[PDB]
Amino acid sequence: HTTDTKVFDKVAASIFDTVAKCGHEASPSKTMMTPYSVEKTQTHAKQG
Amino acid sequence: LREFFILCLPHPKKINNVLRAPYSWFVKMWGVGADPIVVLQSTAGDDRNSKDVFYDKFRTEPNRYKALFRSSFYNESRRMNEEKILEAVKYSQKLG
Amino acid sequence: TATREVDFTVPDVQKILDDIKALAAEQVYKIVKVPSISFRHIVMQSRDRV
Amino acid sequence: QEVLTDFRRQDTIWVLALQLPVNPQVVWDVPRSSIANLIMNIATCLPTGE
Amino acid sequence: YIAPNPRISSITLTQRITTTGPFAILTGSTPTAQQLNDVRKIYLALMFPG
């Protein structure tokens, strides 16, 4: 919804702290949150 | 290829395994963030998991997220992916 | 030939509703303890008049 | 209505910045604005179904 | 020369459902190097009537 960098990192840190509270470990260098790029089970797609 | 074959030479099965994650991430963040963005238009059902997609022409739109990428997330992700290369190439400097 | 021209024929409506929502968070007033000073006095080296 | 519910509701000054019974004549007075009250009616209330 | 606004012949409603113009073929067309000199023969005739 909101395009603001100061409030997006509050969202992204809350994701990685929730997955760390769930016992598991996520990696920031592999987890992607990006609009125009979708990958799903070794199937890559970019900009349609 | 020639710069990558030299790098993955002195230990192929460990260096190629660790270079895989920065290579796949680099393509998957290539086009996003540029100010004019060209897409391929398509429309389907109102579900996001609709498979009945038909396609249209190309068009170039302005990017609504052109300022979001100067955040603390995307600057840390590209800096960590550089270190995974830099830990890998410095391992090959010592071996060969 | 269908790339050189920048599209502006579809206005984004998801952006235009997501800025009205941020416009509701504007705060016009201001809760303050004392009011601002509205009369100040200058001393013209006199013990009787300012 | 949880904000009007806590036990400090007896001594609380409520400051409201926008009245809710919106007089809808000020929306339909915009000149030749009938399309803009249809793209806005779609993007605010239309459900997504299968 | 100024082409008209591209939103005159097409209104988009919900996601990609668009109103189509009747002359959508003649609008989306490019003048060649010969038919552009004939446009400068029409506007030369309008600014000098008789």
CSV table of C-alpha atoms in Angstrom, one decimal:
chain,number,residue,atom,x,y,z
A,1,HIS,CA,0.0,0.0,0.0
A,2,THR,CA,2.4,2.7,1.2
A,3,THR,CA,5.5,3.7,-0.8
A,4,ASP,CA,7.9,4.9,1.9
A,5,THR,CA,11.3,3.6,2.8
A,6,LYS,CA,11.0,4.5,6.5
A,7,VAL,CA,7.9,2.4,7.0
A,8,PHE,CA,8.8,-0.4,4.6
A,9,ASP,CA,11.8,-1.5,6.8
A,10,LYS,CA,9.4,-1.7,9.8
A,11,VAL,CA,7.4,-4.2,7.7
A,12,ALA,CA,10.4,-6.2,6.5
A,13,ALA,CA,12.0,-6.5,9.9
A,14,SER,CA,8.7,-7.7,11.4
A,15,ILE,CA,8.6,-10.5,8.8
A,16,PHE,CA,12.1,-11.7,9.7
A,17,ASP,CA,11.5,-11.5,13.4
A,18,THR,CA,8.3,-13.4,13.1
A,19,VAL,CA,10.0,-16.3,11.2
A,20,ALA,CA,12.8,-16.2,13.9
A,21,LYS,CA,10.2,-16.4,16.7
A,22,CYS,CA,8.7,-19.5,14.9
A,23,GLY,CA,12.0,-21.4,15.5
A,24,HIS,CA,13.0,-21.4,11.8
A,25,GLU,CA,15.7,-19.3,10.1
A,26,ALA,CA,15.3,-17.1,7.0
A,27,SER,CA,18.1,-15.6,5.0
A,28,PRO,CA,17.9,-12.0,3.7
A,29,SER,CA,20.2,-12.7,0.8
A,30,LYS,CA,17.8,-15.3,-0.7
A,31,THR,CA,14.4,-14.0,0.4
A,32,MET,CA,13.1,-11.5,-2.2
A,33,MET,CA,10.3,-8.9,-1.9
A,34,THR,CA,10.1,-7.2,-5.3
A,35,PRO,CA,7.2,-6.1,-7.5
A,36,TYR,CA,8.1,-7.0,-11.1
A,37,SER,CA,9.9,-10.3,-10.4
A,38,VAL,CA,8.2,-13.6,-9.6
A,39,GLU,CA,9.8,-17.0,-9.2
A,40,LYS,CA,8.0,-20.1,-8.2
A,41,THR,CA,9.7,-23.6,-8.0
A,42,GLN,CA,12.6,-23.0,-10.4
A,43,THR,CA,10.4,-21.1,-12.8
A,44,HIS,CA,11.6,-17.5,-13.4
A,45,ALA,CA,9.5,-14.7,-14.8
A,46,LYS,CA,10.4,-11.0,-15.2
A,47,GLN,CA,8.0,-8.1,-16.2
A,48,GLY,CA,5.4,-10.4,-17.7
B,1,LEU,CA,32.3,-17.6,-19.1
B,2,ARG,CA,36.1,-17.2,-19.2
B,3,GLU,CA,36.4,-15.2,-16.0
B,4,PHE,CA,34.0,-17.7,-14.3
B,5,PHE,CA,35.8,-20.8,-15.6
B,6,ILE,CA,39.1,-19.6,-14.1
B,7,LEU,CA,37.4,-18.8,-10.8
B,8,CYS,CA,35.6,-22.2,-10.6
B,9,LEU,CA,38.8,-24.0,-11.7
B,10,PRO,CA,40.8,-24.9,-8.5
B,11,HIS,CA,37.9,-26.3,-6.7
B,12,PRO,CA,34.9,-26.7,-9.0
B,13,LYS,CA,32.3,-28.5,-6.8
B,14,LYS,CA,32.6,-25.9,-3.9
B,15,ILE,CA,33.0,-22.7,-5.8
B,16,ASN,CA,30.2,-23.3,-8.3
B,17,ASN,CA,27.9,-24.3,-5.4
B,18,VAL,CA,28.4,-21.0,-3.6
B,19,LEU,CA,28.3,-18.7,-6.7
B,20,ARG,CA,24.9,-20.1,-7.5
B,21,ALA,CA,23.0,-17.8,-5.1
B,22,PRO,CA,24.5,-14.5,-6.2
B,23,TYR,CA,24.0,-15.4,-9.9
B,24,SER,CA,20.3,-16.3,-9.6
B,25,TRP,CA,19.7,-13.2,-7.4
B,26,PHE,CA,21.3,-10.8,-9.8
B,27,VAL,CA,19.0,-11.6,-12.7
B,28,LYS,CA,16.0,-11.7,-10.3
B,29,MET,CA,16.7,-8.1,-9.3
B,30,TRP,CA,17.9,-6.7,-12.7
B,31,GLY,CA,14.9,-5.0,-14.2
B,32,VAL,CA,13.1,-3.7,-11.2
B,33,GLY,CA,13.6,-0.2,-9.9
B,34,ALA,CA,14.3,1.5,-13.2
B,35,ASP,CA,12.2,4.6,-13.8
B,36,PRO,CA,10.5,3.6,-17.2
B,37,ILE,CA,9.4,0.0,-16.9
B,38,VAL,CA,8.3,-2.0,-20.0
B,39,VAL,CA,5.9,-5.0,-19.3
B,40,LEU,CA,3.9,-7.5,-21.4
B,41,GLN,CA,0.2,-6.8,-20.8
B,42,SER,CA,-2.0,-9.8,-19.8
B,43,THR,CA,-5.3,-10.3,-18.2
B,44,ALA,CA,-6.9,-13.4,-16.5
B,45,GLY,CA,-9.4,-14.3,-13.8
B,46,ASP,CA,-9.9,-12.3,-10.7
B,47,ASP,CA,-8.0,-14.8,-8.6
B,48,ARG,CA,-4.3,-14.3,-8.5
B,49,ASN,CA,-3.8,-18.1,-9.2
B,50,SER,CA,-5.7,-18.0,-12.5
B,51,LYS,CA,-4.1,-19.9,-15.3
B,52,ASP,CA,-6.4,-18.7,-18.1
B,53,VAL,CA,-4.0,-16.0,-19.2
B,54,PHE,CA,-4.2,-14.3,-22.6
B,55,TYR,CA,-1.6,-11.8,-23.7
B,56,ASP,CA,-1.4,-8.4,-25.4
B,57,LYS,CA,1.1,-5.9,-26.7
B,58,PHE,CA,4.1,-4.2,-24.9
B,59,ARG,CA,3.9,-0.9,-23.1
B,60,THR,CA,6.2,1.2,-20.9
B,61,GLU,CA,4.8,2.5,-17.7
B,62,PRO,CA,6.2,4.8,-15.0
B,63,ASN,CA,7.5,3.0,-11.9
B,64,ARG,CA,5.5,3.5,-8.8
B,65,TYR,CA,8.3,2.0,-6.7
B,66,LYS,CA,11.2,4.1,-8.1
B,67,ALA,CA,12.1,5.5,-4.6
B,68,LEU,CA,11.5,2.4,-2.4
B,69,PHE,CA,14.8,0.8,-3.3
B,70,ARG,CA,16.9,3.3,-1.3
B,71,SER,CA,15.8,1.5,1.9
B,72,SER,CA,17.6,-0.5,4.6
B,73,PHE,CA,16.4,-3.8,3.2
B,74,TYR,CA,17.6,-3.6,-0.5
B,75,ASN,CA,20.9,-2.0,0.4
B,76,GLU,CA,21.7,-4.7,2.9
B,77,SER,CA,20.7,-7.5,0.5
B,78,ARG,CA,23.0,-6.3,-2.3
B,79,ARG,CA,25.8,-5.8,0.3
B,80,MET,CA,25.5,-9.3,1.6
B,81,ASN,CA,25.4,-10.9,-1.8
B,82,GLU,CA,28.6,-9.1,-2.7
B,83,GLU,CA,30.3,-10.7,0.4
B,84,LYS,CA,29.2,-14.2,-0.8
B,85,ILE,CA,31.1,-13.5,-4.0
B,86,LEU,CA,34.0,-11.9,-2.1
B,87,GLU,CA,34.3,-14.8,0.4
B,88,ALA,CA,34.2,-17.1,-2.6
B,89,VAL,CA,36.8,-15.4,-4.8
B,90,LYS,CA,39.2,-14.9,-1.9
B,91,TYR,CA,39.0,-18.6,-1.3
B,92,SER,CA,40.2,-19.2,-4.8
B,93,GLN,CA,43.0,-16.6,-4.4
B,94,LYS,CA,44.6,-18.8,-1.7
B,95,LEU,CA,44.1,-22.2,-3.2
B,96,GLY,CA,45.3,-21.6,-6.7
C,1,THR,CA,7.9,1.1,-32.0
C,2,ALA,CA,5.5,0.4,-29.1
C,3,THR,CA,8.2,1.2,-26.5
C,4,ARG,CA,9.6,4.6,-27.4
C,5,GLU,CA,6.3,6.3,-26.3
C,6,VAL,CA,5.8,6.5,-22.5
C,7,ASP,CA,2.3,5.4,-21.5
C,8,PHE,CA,0.1,7.9,-19.6
C,9,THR,CA,-3.3,6.7,-20.8
C,10,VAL,CA,-4.2,4.7,-17.7
C,11,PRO,CA,-3.9,6.7,-14.4
C,12,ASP,CA,-3.0,4.6,-11.4
C,13,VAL,CA,-6.0,4.5,-9.0
C,14,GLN,CA,-4.4,2.4,-6.3
C,15,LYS,CA,-1.9,5.1,-5.8
C,16,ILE,CA,-4.5,7.9,-5.8
C,17,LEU,CA,-6.6,6.2,-3.0
C,18,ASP,CA,-3.5,5.4,-1.0
C,19,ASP,CA,-2.6,9.1,-0.8
C,20,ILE,CA,-6.0,10.3,0.3
C,21,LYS,CA,-5.6,7.8,3.2
C,22,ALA,CA,-2.3,9.5,4.1
C,23,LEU,CA,-3.9,12.9,3.8
C,24,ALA,CA,-6.3,12.0,6.7
C,25,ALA,CA,-3.3,11.8,9.1
C,26,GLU,CA,-2.6,15.5,8.8
C,27,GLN,CA,-2.7,17.3,12.1
C,28,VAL,CA,-3.7,21.0,11.8
C,29,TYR,CA,-3.8,22.0,15.4
C,30,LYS,CA,-1.2,21.8,18.1
C,31,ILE,CA,-1.6,21.1,21.8
C,32,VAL,CA,0.6,23.5,23.8
C,33,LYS,CA,1.0,24.4,27.5
C,34,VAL,CA,1.5,28.2,27.2
C,35,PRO,CA,0.5,30.5,24.3
C,36,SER,CA,3.1,32.2,22.2
C,37,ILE,CA,4.2,35.7,23.3
C,38,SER,CA,2.3,38.4,21.5
C,39,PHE,CA,3.7,41.6,23.1
C,40,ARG,CA,7.4,42.4,23.7
C,41,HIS,CA,8.8,45.5,25.4
C,42,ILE,CA,11.9,47.5,24.5
C,43,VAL,CA,13.7,49.5,27.1
C,44,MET,CA,14.7,53.0,26.0
C,45,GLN,CA,17.0,53.6,29.1
C,46,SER,CA,14.1,54.9,31.1
C,47,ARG,CA,12.8,53.8,34.5
C,48,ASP,CA,9.3,55.0,33.8
C,49,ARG,CA,8.4,54.3,30.2
C,50,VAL,CA,9.0,51.4,27.9
D,1,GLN,CA,-16.1,1.3,19.4
D,2,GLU,CA,-13.2,0.4,21.7
D,3,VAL,CA,-11.9,3.9,22.1
D,4,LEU,CA,-15.1,5.0,23.8
D,5,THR,CA,-14.9,2.1,26.2
D,6,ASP,CA,-11.9,2.4,28.6
D,7,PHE,CA,-12.4,3.6,32.1
D,8,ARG,CA,-11.1,7.1,31.4
D,9,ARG,CA,-14.1,7.9,29.3
D,10,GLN,CA,-15.7,10.1,31.9
D,11,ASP,CA,-12.9,12.7,31.8
D,12,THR,CA,-11.7,12.8,28.1
D,13,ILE,CA,-12.0,15.5,25.5
D,14,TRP,CA,-12.6,14.0,22.1
D,15,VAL,CA,-11.1,15.9,19.2
D,16,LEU,CA,-12.5,14.9,15.8
D,17,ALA,CA,-11.2,16.4,12.6
D,18,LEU,CA,-13.7,15.1,10.1
D,19,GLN,CA,-17.5,14.7,10.3
D,20,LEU,CA,-18.9,11.5,8.9
D,21,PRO,CA,-22.4,12.4,7.4
D,22,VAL,CA,-20.8,13.5,4.2
D,23,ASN,CA,-23.0,15.9,2.3
D,24,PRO,CA,-22.8,14.2,-1.2
D,25,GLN,CA,-23.6,17.3,-3.2
D,26,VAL,CA,-20.0,18.6,-2.9
D,27,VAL,CA,-18.9,15.5,-4.8
D,28,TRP,CA,-21.4,15.7,-7.6
D,29,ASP,CA,-20.9,19.4,-8.1
D,30,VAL,CA,-17.5,19.0,-9.9
D,31,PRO,CA,-18.2,20.0,-13.5
D,32,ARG,CA,-18.7,17.2,-16.0
D,33,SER,CA,-17.5,14.7,-13.4
D,34,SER,CA,-19.4,11.4,-13.9
D,35,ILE,CA,-16.6,9.2,-15.1
D,36,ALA,CA,-14.5,10.1,-12.1
D,37,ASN,CA,-17.3,9.0,-9.9
D,38,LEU,CA,-17.3,5.6,-11.6
D,39,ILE,CA,-13.7,4.7,-11.7
D,40,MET,CA,-13.7,5.7,-8.0
D,41,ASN,CA,-16.9,3.6,-7.3
D,42,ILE,CA,-15.3,0.6,-9.0
D,43,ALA,CA,-11.9,0.8,-7.2
D,44,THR,CA,-13.5,1.2,-3.7
D,45,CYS,CA,-16.4,-1.2,-3.5
D,46,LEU,CA,-16.3,-3.8,-6.2
D,47,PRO,CA,-15.6,-7.3,-4.9
D,48,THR,CA,-13.4,-9.9,-6.6
D,49,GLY,CA,-15.1,-13.3,-7.3
D,50,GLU,CA,-14.8,-16.5,-9.2
E,1,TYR,CA,2.2,20.3,-33.9
E,2,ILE,CA,0.3,18.9,-31.0
E,3,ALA,CA,-1.4,15.5,-31.1
E,4,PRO,CA,-4.6,15.4,-28.9
E,5,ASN,CA,-4.8,13.8,-25.5
E,6,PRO,CA,-4.7,10.0,-25.8
E,7,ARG,CA,-7.4,9.5,-23.1
E,8,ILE,CA,-10.1,11.0,-25.4
E,9,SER,CA,-10.8,7.8,-27.3
E,10,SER,CA,-10.2,5.3,-24.5
E,11,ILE,CA,-11.5,5.1,-20.9
E,12,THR,CA,-10.2,2.3,-18.6
E,13,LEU,CA,-12.7,1.2,-15.9
E,14,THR,CA,-11.5,-1.6,-13.5
E,15,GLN,CA,-8.3,-3.4,-14.3
E,16,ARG,CA,-7.7,-3.6,-18.1
E,17,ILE,CA,-11.3,-3.3,-19.4
E,18,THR,CA,-11.0,-0.4,-21.7
E,19,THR,CA,-13.4,1.5,-24.0
E,20,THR,CA,-12.3,1.0,-27.6
E,21,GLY,CA,-12.3,3.9,-30.1
E,22,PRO,CA,-13.9,3.4,-33.4
E,23,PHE,CA,-11.0,4.7,-35.5
E,24,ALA,CA,-8.4,2.7,-33.4
E,25,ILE,CA,-6.5,1.7,-36.6
E,26,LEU,CA,-6.2,5.3,-38.0
E,27,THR,CA,-5.1,6.8,-34.7
E,28,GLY,CA,-2.4,4.2,-34.1
E,29,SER,CA,-0.6,4.9,-37.4
E,30,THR,CA,2.6,6.7,-38.5
E,31,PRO,CA,2.8,9.3,-41.2
E,32,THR,CA,5.5,8.5,-43.8
E,33,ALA,CA,8.0,11.1,-45.2
E,34,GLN,CA,5.6,11.9,-48.1
E,35,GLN,CA,2.2,12.1,-46.3
E,36,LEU,CA,3.8,14.5,-43.8
E,37,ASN,CA,4.6,17.0,-46.4
E,38,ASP,CA,1.0,17.0,-47.5
E,39,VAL,CA,-0.1,17.9,-43.9
E,40,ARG,CA,2.1,21.0,-44.4
E,41,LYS,CA,0.2,21.7,-47.6
E,42,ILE,CA,-3.1,21.7,-45.7
E,43,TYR,CA,-2.1,24.0,-42.9
E,44,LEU,CA,-0.5,26.3,-45.5
E,45,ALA,CA,-3.9,26.5,-47.1
E,46,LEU,CA,-5.8,27.3,-43.9
E,47,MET,CA,-3.6,30.2,-42.8
E,48,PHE,CA,-3.9,31.7,-46.3
E,49,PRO,CA,-7.6,31.4,-47.2
E,50,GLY,CA,-8.2,32.5,-50.7
